[PDB]
Structures are given as structure tokens and as C-alpha cells.
Symmetry: D3
Subunit: 311 residues, 6 copies
């Protein structure tokens, strides 16, 4: 119930070496030269310049994404946008450009092997169909390790741009994107604000027992194929290093979140769990009649919130 959801705050599952793991990971990332590249890209828009932007990241993977900038003298405020799980079509260029038309230098980072970008990370062994369980038996090999770092590197690259006001950079996204937005804000102090639509990758131990649809269930499919009890124990150990309930505590930027009460993909409880772990200026928008989908009303909130803090 809404009354219980408002109070649901599961106990962190972070291991003693939680922060050490990330400290090291950030370091390995730092050992890679960004070597960013910009390439003009033609698009039927007036008042905005569009480019294709790539840069080197963790494991020497080349990360892609479209970069749209308001066509005028800046520095303009900027946004790094993250897309949903297996939900990126044509690098979501139309969204990127529209954000630019709203006055934001925007870059839509494409998640490794999904919407685009290269993934050099080896596949240690078998796993369920999907990205959720690639290299899940070790925090070092897990899929989202590289992804999280790419999100951080993305901010480093954007911030370094001359036409970008480094003091007015925001991160936004829904589900997977919202999770990347929060993880990036937790692992970096570059973003000034965070907006996350029903964030994914949160409260994994409950998610696998409450979700009714993919992709959380990819973990269940994994356990079905690997009956060893130790596998389950090790898998959840790995996931704890990437769980939002453990990362939320490091977020110090103002955060705006949304949750649809009939969401079957990113269950309300998993989202409230992340929200209730945030120790910063925050606000959660609850929509009774919406699920894992585009919520018109929240779009107004999003625009208003970003405008207030960046525009």
C-alpha cells in the first residue's frame, strides 16, 4: 500500500569493499584517454547543431551517442540523457534534438551493445538471454560496471566542452536511464541535478520476487539454468555493488523521481526503496493510474525542474 511504500526502506546490501570497488574502478577508467571525437550530422532542424560524439572508456571501449547543441553563443546548460533497457531506436536522435531546442546542449549516451557503443568486456561464462546477467558472477566482470563508468566518462567529456557551462549540467533518464542518471550523480560531482523516471537496477533481492515482466526476470531465468545455491549467493553479492539502494546515499544533488503505481517492470517498492535511501533535496511524483510508460504530467514536472535549476 501507499502507506507502506512511503516507509519502505530496505537495509543496504553493500559489502565492506563497496566504496573501494568503485574507487578502483574509477581509477582504471582514469587510465584511459577519452580522445573524444565530434562529427557533424545532418538533421532537418533549424536552430540546432547536431553531431555524432564518441570517446574512449573503461576497457578501451568506444562509446557513441548523438550530441545536439543550441545554435547560438553559449555556454549553454547541458544534459546527458540515458536510454532505457533495449529501448533505443536510431540513437533516440529526435529526443536529443528536442532537448537542444529547449535550450540544452544534450548528449544521449548509448549503452554498450544496446543502442550503440562498443563493449570489449569478455563474457566469463554462460548467462541468461539479455544483458542483466553478463559476467554476473563477479563485480569486476559484471556488465553494468563498464556502463556506469561510461556514464561518468560521458560527464567528464561534456563538461570539458567550451560551449558548455560546467556548473549547469544535468543527468536524466527513465528505468535503466534513470538508474544511470542516479549512479552517475553518485559516482561523480559534475552533474548539478538529477531526474529519474522510475529507476531500474534497485533493490534486486525484492525485485526478483515482485516484478511481473522483463528484464528483472532475466535473473530468475539465470537461476533456473544454474541450480547451484552458491551461484545465487554470488550473483546477489555482485548485484549489491550496483544496487541503487547502496548508491543513493552518495547522491548530493537535487533529485526528482517519478513512479507509476501500476508499474510491473520497475515495481513501485523497488523505486521507493531507492528514493527512501536518498539523503538530499528530493521529490517523488506518484502516479496512481500509470505504469512503466511515458507519463505526460511528469514531463511538465521534469521540464519545470530542469528549467528552474539549469535554465
Amino acid at each position: 500500500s501507499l502507506e507502506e511504500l512511503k516507509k519502505y526502506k530496505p537495509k543496504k546490501t553493500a559489502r565492506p569493499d563497496f566504496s573501494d570497488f568503485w574507487k578502483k574502478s574509477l581509477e582504471e577508467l582514469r587510465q584511459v584517454e577519452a580522445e573524444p571525437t565530434l562529427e557533424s550530422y545532418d538533421y532537418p532542424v533549424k536552430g540546432v547543431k547536431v553531431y555524432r560524439l564518441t570517446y574512449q572508456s573503461f576497457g578501451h571501449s568506444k562509446i557513441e551517442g548523438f550530441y545536439a547543441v543550441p545554435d547560438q553563443t553559449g555556454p549553454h546548460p547541458a544534459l546527458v540523457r540515458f536510454h532505457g533497457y533495449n529501448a533505443s531506436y536510431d540513437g533516440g536522435i529526435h529526443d536529443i534534438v528536442n532537448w537542444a531546442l529547449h535550450g540544452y546542449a544534450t548528449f544521449g549516451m548509448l549503452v554498450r551493445g544496446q543502442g550503440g557503443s562498443e563493449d570489449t568486456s569478455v563474457t566469463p561464462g554462460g548467462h541468461a538471454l539479455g544483458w542483466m546477467t553478463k559476467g554476473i558472477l563477479s563485480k569486476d566482470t559484471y556488465y553494468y560496471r563498464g556502463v556506469y563508468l561510461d556514464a561518468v566518462r560521458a560527464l567528464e567529456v561534456i563538461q570539458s566542452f567550451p560551449e558548455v557551462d560546467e556548473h549547469r549540467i544535468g543527468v536524466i533518464g527513465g528505468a535503466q536511464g534513470g538508474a544511470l542518471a542516479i549512479a552517475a550523480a553518485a559516482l561523480s560531482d559534475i552533474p548539478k541535478v538529477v531526474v529519474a523516471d522510475y529507476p531500474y537496477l534497485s533493490n534486486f533481492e525484492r525485485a526478483v520476487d515482485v516484478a511481473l515482466e522483463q528484464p528483472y526476470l532475466e535473473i530468475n531465468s539465470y537461476f533456473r539454468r544454474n541450480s547451484d545455491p552458491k551461484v545465487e549467493e554470488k550473483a546477489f553479492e555482485t548485484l549489491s555493488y550496483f544496487d541503487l539502494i547502496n548508491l543513493a546515499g552518495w547522491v548530493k544533488q537535487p533529485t526528482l523521481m517519478a513512479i507509476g503505481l501500476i508499474d510491473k517492470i520497475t515495481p513501485p517498492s523497488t523505486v521507493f526503496a531507492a528514493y527512501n535511501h536518498l539523503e538530499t533535496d528530493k521529490d517523488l511524483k506518484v502516479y496512481r493510474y500509470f505504469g512503466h510508460e511515458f507519463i505526460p504530467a511528469f514531463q511538465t514536472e521534469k521540464l519545470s525542474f530542469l528549467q528552474k535549476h539549469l535554465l
Copy 2:
């Protein structure tokens, strides 16, 4: 839902192989040969009597470590052998129970696990975005395509098995269903080690039609790919890549006796895609058609399978 039986019997789509088809594989096999197998065996406890069970790994294309269980009849050989390939994302606990049962039928059996699926390592980089699944990983290039490494692993597997002392290299067979049947055929086409081939409704065949006739996963992964990459050239390049791995192009190299099965109401590996591969085989072959079965275990064909293998390898 697919073609009638009269048309199916005559369906033989034009090969889509490019001029460099055989060259591509010739090079691929070479790169594979540049990797030392360095196989390893490790005893594995299992509640069976009369059979020895092991965990077997070996190095393959791109230096990937391939896994799989290896069961051998507990007695003096050399015993005939079988390399078994599992279905797409359909491997549970490395299918050990099946492996062991095959051994109990008198065969030295190895169930190779497909890269990143049932097990095994996949070192191959992911060039760029692709649809959820393995079907489109590195699909924009025959060199980077997922099944390139897999096919080679299948070949290397045979090289490893054959080299075993307790294995009669003249009585080695390859079996599998769907993805497994496709790997069985591809291995026989790329190697002369196997003496016989059994493939239950083979997958990875007649791609250009499959994407227009399949009603369920995983062929539709290709469709999802094109939805996310509207560029017309992408489609053209993707099918170019697939042609190098299509069974209608590999079948022609199979010279071993082949037994195949097809369920007429199969929605995953459409009858037409399977007949297409079959009609491209130029060797002793036989296709078992089951009117009331789909993409599933077909009891009646199991008898055929056993009988066929027994005749050519066992008795």
C-alpha cells in the same frame, strides 16, 4: 501456417553465398588452428553407475575457453562418440542428465556449451548496438558475427574428442536440435571428422524467409534489430553477414549421412526454413515429417535417432 507439404517438398531457395564464402571459412579455420587446444579433464561426481563423468574445457577461436560435460561408458573402448549441441538459450545445468544418458547408451559424449549461453567464455568484442539476444551480436560483419566463434568451437570440439584414446575416431557423430542441429550440420560441413549427423528441426537456415515467416523468437531478434536501425544499408549488410552462416549455403558441403526432423506446426523453426536446408543436402539423407508436432521433443523421432545412430556407430 507455413507452406503445404507438396510445396515444401520442392522448396529449394537460391543459395545466398557470396564469392568469398569458402574463403571466409578457410581463413577462419586457419585462425582457429593458430590456437592451442590445451584441453583439460576433471572428474565430476554424478549418481550414475557404469559411466565416468568429467568436465572438459579447451581453447578455441579468439582464445575462448569452451566448457561442457564429458561422459564415457565405464569400460574398455574405444567407444563410439557423440558431440551434442544444445538449443538457443535452452541449456540448464549444462544438460548433464542428457549427456550421461547418452553415455549409458554406449557413447562417449560431450555436450559443448555455446559461448555465453549454457556456458563457455566469449572473448569476441561487441562492435556496436544490437537487439536483446545473441542473434545480432556483431551482425554487421562476418568477422565479428557471434556464430563465427561458435561454429569454430564446434569444429575444435571434434578435434579434441577425436584425439582421445578411448574414442574411435571413425565412429563419431554430431547431434542437436534447432540451434544444436544447426551446429551439428555446420560442424559436419566444416569438418570431415564426424561420420554421421542428426539434426532436429535445424535453426539458422534460410534467414531471408525466416524473418518473414517465424512467429516467435529467436529469429525475430533480427526484426527487432532492423526496427532499432532503420538505415536501409544496415539491413543489406546484416543479411550479407548472415549468408556466411546460413545452412542453405553450408549444407552443400555435408557428405555424411544425415537424419532430420520437422514438425509441421513449428513456429520457431518454420517448416519451410528446415526443408530449405534439407533440399540443399547432397548426401544420404532422410527427413522425418511430423504433422502434429512443433518446436518440441518428438518421441517418435527419438526412436529414429537412436536407431540411426546405433546402425551407423554402435551396432
Copy 3:
């Protein structure tokens, strides 16, 4: 699921228009002209920069008050303009976010809301029973049919927009998908105000085939109607009424450049019904065919849409 492409490219069903087709509309436009627009603008706050947003209403057929958001680029014009029509029962919050984004692309945009759906008033009486939905309201007579008022509202909308000072009347376009695309085409056919037309898989086309080929709502609303009214004459009269609103009969009056899209696996607006309308257009036209898309947002066509509108209006 539909008929081969090679056949689709040649599918051109025989018009079903009755002798009084054009007369019916001539009279309808007249009745509409007997109503004073009396438009109204009201500022509306929206978290956007560089665009002014308003709520716009005006009187139309049967004295119905029509609603819609109106967004204009915040700067000296006259700016080119677009009248956007939304899909069947597919309007949320008057689709304000789309309206505003169009304005941000440099177009004075008005998203007309279809009577009783996304908004707007519908004074038209309900003659008798009909299936759940709008598709069969007053279907037993062309005078009482639901889309009669809607079509006229679309026309009146253009009259209102065109009269605006910050709007260049020579650069006005109509766009929409499914129901919206049908309204865009119908408006261009009944008026000469719009310069260009863009229609994503248009609805309300080739009714007699649609009811035998569609796999999902809302075309099937007609089938539900016939199930509840077994009288043979009802079916005959219903299709007679529909003929006056069918795109295969209106397309012939469209003289503006038209851009259309169709997803080959569309179950709602079957490919054949869309090709039928397209093949009846006698004007500069182009149909974008997408093999792997259905009745949904097609990213690739969005580029075409922007490009086409930019070329003809910007």
C-alpha cells in the same frame, strides 16, 4: 498478414461515392459557414523558453465549442503554421508536449481536439443505438454521422488559424496519424487553405475492405454494430453513410503535396486500406513503406516528416 506488396502498389478500389457526394459536403460547409467562429485565446503557462502557449476555442458545426492548445514561436513572424490532429481516443492532456515541440521547430501550432475525445464539445444528438465507441454514432445517416461535425471542425480550424496575424496563410500545413492523418487529408480535400499534407497511416479509408481485414479496434466497432443490428438494410445503409467520409472518395480532391507512411505489419490501419487512399491521390505524393513497423511511431518517418515540412514551409 495483408496482401503482397506488388499487389498493394496496384490496389485501387472503385470509389464508393454516391451521386450527391460533393453536394453533401457543399451543404455541410454552408451550414458550418452559418456559425460564427468567435475564437478565443487564453495564455497558458508551460515550462518552455522561446515559445508562447495558449488555449484556443472556437465555434463550429452545430454550435460546438472546439478546444485545443496553441503554441507559437516567441518572436516576430509571420511564422509558418501547422494544425495537428490526434489519433482515435489517443489524446492525453491535449498532447500539449507535442504542440509545444512543434512550435520549438518554428511552427505556429494548434492541436485540435476531436469532439468528445481529447476535448471539445459535441452537440450532435445520438439518433439511436450504436456500438461502444465513436465509429458508429449516428451511422444510419450522413447528416447525423459523428465524423461530419469532426471534419467540419477541422476545416473551421484552418479558417481560424489562417486569420491570425502572426500566421503566414501561404505556409500552413496539416499533419496527423491514423485518425489524425485522416483528418489532415479530409481537411485538405475540403479546403484550399493548407499548403501541404502529412499523414501517418491514415484511418477511415476503404471501409468495406477494412472491416474484413482489420485485426484490432477501432474499425471492428463497425462489426460490433452489425452484430447487434442483424437487419440487412442496416448494413447497407451504414456503408452508404461511410462512403461520404471515406478517404478513397475524398483523396481525389486533394491538390496539395502529400507525404504518407505505412507500416507493413499494421493491424489497426491495414496496409491495403492505406494504399487504397494513396492510390486515389492525384497530386504530388510519396508513400513511405516500413516493412518492420506497425501502427506505431516510426522514427525514420519522423525525419522524413520534418524534412518534408521544412522544405515546403520553412
Copy 4:
């Protein structure tokens, strides 16, 4: 099972949501209705039945709407007892003439009123603004413009018309219906003293605030679709305010006639709790038939009850 426990259902009695002007609203509505001349009309209608006369009956009602319906009377000297039958939501085919005629064959002068724009009848009421696909939310932002305002009055006027017939014993008139029909039967009995008995199969339009959170199928969910399209918080508040004027938990209190109701425990359309809520608000001779293994459908066993109950009170 999916709703509240049977033990809890028997005690579920939600607090009325009626506003201070509840009874005033209806008092005025009945008055506006009275300002319209019925001007009924009868027209012979041919039907393959023996022993029954069938007619088409229309009459003027609220907003000057012409209401339709078939009228069947036992072919013999009366006055006969009479029934006004109301049909389910968008569930009327050919004006349900076969049911009408069968009721007449049971000895009842029967009239099946057709709900505005659904099974038949005219609806003059204007559509104030946008609303969800369906009738549930037409003019929902005001009790004066709400769809069921005209419908309820039509049901009342129907009774006035029937009662005035010479071949009808005004002291033996009943109202029956299921779901929407049962709701109209109860509403009519609450707003009129003409009917002697009421039978309602799992009544609809009851306990709206809970219904929208418990229903698993249409048409209650039309309200949810409405709120999805109109995010304004005030809209929700105003919509429920409007619904309260038509909610059975607020009208039941005015029912003084003997009432028979049925509820299927696995009903997903008219959830058991919404039905028990209406029943528990009735202050009159009543009886609720509970069927564990039935849902929103025809319940054979309750048909016997229905016939037996009507026969006892009217026959």
C-alpha cells in the same frame, strides 16, 4: 478468488458518498422529466410466437429523447403483471426481443427499455467535452450533464408509461436486470414507488471509488482511462463527486421494495465487494444469492430463484 473474504464481504458497508444536495438533485431531475410529455406510441411487430402479442414502444423522456424498446404481452384478457427489463452495458443485440417474448410467455407484460445510444433509443444530451471511449465518462464533470442522469430518468418514465396501460395491473409491476440492468432496476425502484419488486443480477454502478481499484476488466476501467488522459487532480475529485450522485450505495437507502440479488464470487467486471456494498446498504426485505464458481455471467441456478421470486410476488 481475488476480492475480499466472504466473511469480510458480508460485513463490507462503505460510508455513503452522497453530497448534501443528493436528494435535491434528483427531486429537480424528476421535475424536469415531468415537464416532458410521454406521448407513448405502440406499433405491432411480427414475431414467430403463439400466445403473445409483440409491439415496438417509444415515449418521450428527459431532454426530449425518444426512448425505444420491445413490448410483449400475454395474448389473453388481463390485467397481467408486468416487468420492465433493463439490458447490460453495450450488451444488447436486436433489442433482446427473444428474452422479452419469453418473459411474456411466462405470463408477464414485458418491456425491454433500450439504454440511450446503446441497445437503442435517442440521446439528446450534449457532450460537454472530452472523455474516455465509452459511455461511463460522458459528461462526467457535472451531475447535470452525466450520461446516467438521462438513463435513470428514462427508467422512471418507462414505469410511468407501463403502469398507465389498461392491460397492466399497476400493483404488480417489477424491475429486473443484470449488471447495468440491475443497476437501473435498483435506481428505478429508489426513484419511483411504482415497482412492487426488484431483481438485480450483480448490479453495476456501485461503490465507484473502490470499483476503480478492484475491477480487472471493462467498463469500470473506462474511468481509469479517463484519469490517464486528464491528469489534473481536480478532474479526479470532480469526477468522483459526479459519480456519487449515481452510486447505488447512496440510492439503495431509498429502496423499500423486496429485493433479490445475485453475485458470482469470481466476478471481475462487477467485483463482489462493490455488489455486497450495495446490498449492505439496502434497508428492506432482501436476499443475496452468492455463487462461488460463477463470474459476470448467466447463472442457471439464480434463474430459478429469479422466476420463483417474481412468481411469488407478481404471478
Copy 5:
């Protein structure tokens, strides 16, 4: 197929040389059993109609049940034997029976062995798919519908023998399975004067199994999946041929009224047209474009009108 093709679809009969002999013998075995009918008053909230429970002995000495409703007045009244759909009988469909009586017909709703009611003594030879469709399917002598068909015949014999029943005005009606029993009964007996069958089932079996999209025809497919032996399939269809309507229709000489919904997935239009096109008698088929395997209001008027004309 298209309505144009459906109108001409007339599959070749599958009847074996001993077709008529099989039934001739079956009718004889039936005749060796004493009906010994029984009537028992049954209370029902109806006025103007008397209701009873009627049982009688049939093939294999099975006791057949059913409700019997008669107009409460001096007859003899015309009569109807109603057959219910496959596994579609609730409370012996008493409400329908009673309503028919209220329409002026002495009506008996025979309940099909083990389904809506009635006893089934026939042994189960061996394994078969879940359902009745394949019980004893490996032999025409042991097949489930053999006993059912005969019960339908015996039912007419019993009804006809009633004093309050005009034996020259007896009809048989039913939908799907019921319609199949109505036709089969008219083909195996000359007692009924008219036949009404809503989208008849048990027709054109060899095509039905390849065209049906839902149960219960698919029960045959389930059977073949569980019994891979090729001979099993051959023998099964051999058995079915003895009960197929395309082989029985030719013996129907009574006026017949049929209905078919073009979107029917249970009793595919082609299987129904196949039966219809094999009828050599006064007949008429009502085609409904927008209806499937369900109650069709418009056809109900036709049904009433047709029965009224020929019996009323």
C-alpha cells in the same frame, strides 16, 4: 475458404463399404434393449407447463436422462428433442427445455452420456486424449458416439410413443454437437418431421483437424501426438468415417435448416458447408458473416419461424 468456394465445397464421402451395415446392426443391438421409460414430476417455477425427469434404457443398457417439459393443456402437442453442445450442459439446460414447452412444444432435452448427464456403460478400450472425442476411437464398435447416436434414436422412439405427443409433428434441434445429433438422428430414423442444426459438429473430420483453431476437434490431434504409430491415425479416421455427417447427410429426407457463422473457429465454415452440400432434401443454410461459434439472435427467429411453419 471464400464464400464462393464454400458454396461449392463438397468433399468426397469417406464411408466404407460396410457403412450402412454397421448402423443396421447397431440399430438392431439397440432394439434388443427394452426402453422401460420412466417419468417423475419435477417442480419448476413456471405456469402453464408441466415438467418431468425422463429416463429410459438404451444401447449397452445405459440409462439415459433428460428433462421433459409439456404444455399444460390438452394435446397432442407437437414435440421437440433437443440435443446440447459438447460439454456445454448446465443443470440439464432445464430453462431452455421449459421455454420451448412455453412455445407450444412437448420438449425433451436428452443428456449426452457422461456429459450433461446419463450413464455410459461402454468400456474404455485403451488410452485416449483428454475428452470424449477419442474414447474407443480405434474401433467403430467401441467409439463413444456410437452409443450416443443410438440414444438419440431411442429418445425419438420414446417421445413418439407418448399419448400427449403427435407423432407426425416431431422435430430435432441442436447446435454444434447437438446439431450433429439432430442430423444423425434424422438420418438413422424416420420419426422426426423436421431438422434444425446450428453449425453442426462431427463433420468432415479429415479437414476439421487441419482447419479448426480450438477444441474439441483438436482432441484428435492430441490423440495422434500421444500415439505416433501411423496405423493409429489410419484406423482412427476409418472409425470416424462411420460417424461423419458427410456420410450420414445423404440419408436425411426431412426439411433441414442450418446456420453457420463465417468466423467460427470451433466448427469451421468449410466443415459445415461440407455437411450441408451433402444433403439431398429441402434445405436452407443461413450464413452469418459477423458471428462465430455462438448464439446467433437472427437465426433464433429463423429457427422459431421454421419450426412453427412445419410443426405449429
Copy 6:
């Protein structure tokens, strides 16, 4: 979708057995004894090496001829033996491949086919109407109920196997899943011939709860029955009949070591119905709980099964 694991571990519904429970079976076993087994063996060709395969029939309750494949390790015995029972309407080609594989594991195995399902004759008359399926055949009386004959066939099967020379009567086991597991437990309860019992998510247990918790067939066959027979007494009598065959009433007679499995997301044999049976066992027992599996083949439990049988028989 059931209760918590904490509650399941403690769920032990009150037995529903009637005073004449044990008397009913005592008589039933007697009637069975009045029938001469008259078993028959017939060689059957199968592409296997090291195993002999036969078709075995024998007479049982009501003089029904029961079938099944019989595979024996091709070597000098006596070998340990297994009687395998198949799932509800889940037998294809008499599951010969499984039978033969068991034999290859060293067990003389007989896969009894359940009356009218996988094979075997069912002479029992059908008293009256019932729902589509076997679950409610003759449900209005314990004497006429379908599973009465089936249970006895299971017992007679053990009598026949035990009597074989190549079979060590002190090492005979019964195994099965769902319906098969229910037959394995019932047989062990009605006979002292089997030394061990293995039952995968046993069916036919805790009927009164099952009908309110099951989400799929075949338990729901009972619900279909009550829908077609509204008489309140019917329901009462039906559950009375079922009580005589419910595992929660038979489990108490099982004295052999028992191994059971349950998938927590099982919708066919709900976890609670299986735990109810398990918690009524008063013998060496162990229940394997699988969180991510349902009514299906569970690889991990197969290892347990093999290991358990090997320990007690091989």
C-alpha cells in the same frame, strides 16, 4: 502466489477422512484380490543395447486390462525395480524412452499406464454427467470414482513386479510426478511392497484448498463440475468422495522413506497442497523446495532423485 515459505512449512490441514476410510480401502483391496493377475510379457524391439524391453499387461480391479512397458537390464539379476507412474494426460508413446533409460540406470522398470490415459482399459461405468476430463468421473460415489480403479491398478502392479524372478522384492521403488507422484504415494500407503518413494510435486492432495488456489487444470475440472451441477448437495457429496483419495489422508499410512519436490511458482499443484501432503507424512522424509521452478522438470531434483534411489536400492 501461495502463502509464505514460513507458513507453508507449518501448513498441516485437518484430515478429511471419514470413519469408514480404512474400511473402504480394505474392501477395495479385497475386490482387487478377487481378480487373477494373469500377467503377460511380450518382447518389444527398441534401439537400445544392454536392456531387454517388453510390453506387460495384467488384470486388475473390475477386470480391466492394464498396460505398460517393461524394461530390464540385460544381465543376471535380481535387479532392483521401479514402478513409474505418468502425469495427468501427459503420456506419449507410453513414455518408453524414460522406462528404457531407467533400466539403463540399473533398474527393472515398469511404466504403468493410467486407465484411459496413456493406455490401459477402464471397465468402470460412468454413473452420470461430469466435467470434461477424468477428475470427476463417478465423483458422486467413492465406489464409482475414477481413481479407485487406478489406485488399485498401482497396487496390483507392485504385486506383479514383485513376483518376477529377475526382481529383488526387497528393493522395489515407486516414482512419479504430479499424478504419478500421487500414485507413488498412494501405492506405498496401500501396500508394503515398495521400499522407497519419490514424488515430484504430488497431485490429488488437499482438494478443498486446491480448488480455491489452483490457477490451471486439472484441479479446476472440479470447479467446472460444480458450475454444471448447482445443487449444493452435489458439492458436499463430491468432496466426501474425494476425501477417500486425498493424500493428506493416505500419507499417514506411508512408512517408507520418501523424497518430494515442490516448485514455489507451481500453478498446477500449488505449493500449499504439496506441503499439506508432506506435513502429513510420519516417516523418514525430505522435501526439496525450488524457488524458481513450477510444475515442470527440475534438473536439480533429478540429481536428488537418482542419488536417493541409488542409495536405497542400487
